[PDB]
């Protein structure tokens, strides 16, 4: 049954391979490892989650955050672009992409990211953070 | 699909990481993909754009070509998802937002579509695209 999803490209979530409440528990445990600084374990758990459902925006954001913490900034930025697309109107991944671009020495790209947050987002606290980066970029 | 390939690659080096296909060859394959597309050979064009997006997913031109094919095929959610990737990457115009609005209308999500068309009117400098977006808004 699982092999069928491997051959059809479907997710494990599409075939309800693990119950909903158990997946919730695994996501909460992943976030616990993350908040405790247990980065290697959080990375295993967020990779597990993204294998289970690679369209879940919160699962992708968790793995992207791990990569950003590990200073794998391009790999983080790649996942953030997917996370943005799947959620359509949440500019948090665009904000974090701006941070990654600064670390990649691409300040004009970073400015474009933070400006996009300011222009489109309805999240006032997020826009405040984005503006503080814009104020600092030369 | 293209998005699942991108995520699996990120979970797990890639072909692009080793410069396995040079720029000029990718340019040629892109032009061949549109040759198929322009002749109505949509299935072959889809294979070629999928090939391009496996090699270099984070490329606005490849993403936009594949999104157009899904919209024509009435695979509206897949099209909307790819248009949003194109916009996030830096696509310097609001055309992917406009087309996402069209897709959301077909998905019976008129409130999502309204948000898309309103973004076009507020932020695009393409006066013709703005008129088109307003005509959809007038109908919602
Ligand atoms: C869920 S309401 C909504 N707000 N913004 C969008 C949006 C933004 C950029 C792009 Cl490229 C496509 C769509 C959207 C949708 N769908
Ligand atoms: Cl959507
Ligand atoms: Cl730059």
Swiss-Prot record, chain B:
GO MF: identical protein binding
GO cellular component terms, A-Z: cytoplasm
Primary role: Assists the correct folding of nascent IpaB. Once it is bound to IpaB, it binds to IpaC and impedes their premature association that would lead to their degradation in the absence of IpcG.
Classification via InterPro entries: T3SS_Ca_resp_chp_LcrH/SycD (IPR005415), T3SS_Ca_resp_chp_LcrH/SycD_sub (IPR016379), TPR-3 (IPR011716), TPR-like_helical_dom_sf (IPR011990)
Top-level taxon of the source organism: Bacteria
Family matches, as Pfam families: TPR_3 (PF07720)
Keyword Lipoprotein included in the entry's annotation: no
Family: Belongs to the LcrH/SycD chaperone family.
Protein name: Chaperone protein IpgC
Major location (coarse): cytoplasm
Organism: Shigella flexneri
Subcellular location: Cytoplasm
Cited SUPFAM superfamilies: TPR-like
Assigned keywords, A-Z: Chaperone, Cytoplasm, Plasmid, Virulence
